[model samples]
Target chain A: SMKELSTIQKREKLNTVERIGSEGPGGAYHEYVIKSNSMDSQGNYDVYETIKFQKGARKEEKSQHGVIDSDLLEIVRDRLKSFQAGPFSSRENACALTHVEEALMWMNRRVEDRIERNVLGTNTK
Target chain B: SMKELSTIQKREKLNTVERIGSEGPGGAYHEYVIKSNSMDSQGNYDVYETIKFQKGARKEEKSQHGVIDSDLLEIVRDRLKSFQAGPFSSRENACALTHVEEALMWMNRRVEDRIERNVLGTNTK
Candidate 1:
C-alpha cells in the first residue's frame, strides 16, 4: 500500500519537458525531442525521442521509442550527490550507490580511452 | 599545447562546495564535508571528505581522500543533455555519450533490482 502510494506520488510529480533545443546545423539540423505518455502501473513512462531534421520543412526524420522507469534518472541524480541524501545504509541505497560508482568509473575510463585514441590519432597523422 | 591550455582553463574554472549537510542522528550525527586544494597540472583536484560527528564537539571522524578530474562530473552533466551540446560524432563526444547511455542503463537495472528485492522481501515476510 505504501509502495502504491509512493508510485502515485511520483506520478503526480511527473513533469516531462515538452521539447529541448535541437542539435546540429545552426540554421537547420536534427532536433532531438522527447515526448512521453502517462506512467503505467509499474511507474514507467512510454517515452519517444525524435530526430527532426530541419524545422518541419523536410519530413526526413528518425525516432527511438522506449519505456523509462520514473525513478531511473532521479536515482542517478541522487546517488551522484547532485541532489541530497538521507541515511547511509540500506540494501536499496547500497545497490544504487554501487551502480552509480560503477557508472562513474565507466565514464572515467571512456574519457581516458578517448584521450588515448586522440593522442594516437594525432601521432599517426 | 592545446591540451595544456585546456587544463589551465579548467583549473581557472575549478570550484567546489565547502560543506554539505551531514547524515544520521539529527542534531548529533555525521556531517559530510568536502574540501579541496588547487587543481594540479593535469586538471585534477585533491579533494577530501570528512564525516564529522557532531559540530566540532566530538573528534571521532572518518574521511575519504581522492583526486577527481575536473571534467568528470561536468562530462556526465553534459552528456545527460542537462546542458547544451555542440556537433555530434566527434570521438570525444561519442565516447561521452556512450558512457552516459551506459550509466543510464546501469541506473535502470539498479532500480529494477531494488524493486524486485523489495517485492521478494515483502512476500517473504
Candidate 2:
C-alpha cells in the first residue's frame, strides 16, 4: 500500500486588516488575513506564519492626525500567536477559529502579494 | 463542461543569481518554495509576482556582516515569460503548476512569518 507522503499542509481564508499603508480598490484595503500553515510532518513545525495584509480603513483617517486604528497589527499578532503556541500543543490540532483565520488570510494574501508584487516590481524596489 | 487547460509548461529547472542579503532557515535559504509556477491557461500576464523570502544563516545571522541570502523571492517568473507569454496568448486558467509551485512555495512560507511575529513583540518595539 502506498502511504501518504508527508509533504506539507496549507490553508487560507478572508477577513479584514482594518489599517494599511495606502488606499484604492486595489490599494491594500480588504482587511487582514492570516495565511496560517505549518511545515514538517514529524517534529519541526510552526503554526500560521504568513500575514495577509489588506486594507480596511481609509488612508485619510490614518494621517497620525487621522482617525484610524493601526493597532490591527497587534490584533493579527495575538490571533496568530494563539494559533501557533496553542494548536501545536493540542492533541488533534483542533483549530476552528484558527482555520477560518487561515483561509481568510490565505486568500487575502494571494490577492495582497499579487498586488504588492505588481507595485514593488522585482527586486523589492 | 469544465476542464483543465492544456498549456506548454515544462518547469524550467536550474539556477540563477548568486548573492542575496540576510540569513536563517529561509535569510532568505533552506529556501522557501515559491510554487515555481509558469505558463498560462486563458491569457498571458505578468512575468512574476508574489515574492517568497526564506532564511539562510545566523542573530538571525543578520550581523550586517552576516553573509545573508536575504531573499530569493521565488515566484512564477523569468522562465515564466517562456510559459505565461507563450501559452496564454492562447489558453490556460490551467491554474495549477501555479498550483504546485504554489504548493511548495506555499509550504515553505508557512515557516518564515511565523518566526517574525513570534519574535516581534507586536504591541510595540
Q: Each prediction's DockQ?
A: 0.06, 0.02
Candidates' RMSD to native = 15.4, 19.3
Error of 1 at B14 (Å): 6.2
Off by over 4 Å in 2: A1-22, A26-101, A105-125, B1-43, B60-125
What TM-score number comes out for model 2? 0.21
Q: Best-fitting candidate, measured by DockQ? A: 1
Clashing residue pairs found in predicted model 1:
none
> What interface-residue Cα RMSD does candidate 2 give after superposition?
17.4
Kindly list the per-residue Cα lDDT of model 1 for residues A2-45, writing each as its tens digit. 00111111221212223335333322122333333356589765
Per-prediction TM-score: 0.31, 0.21
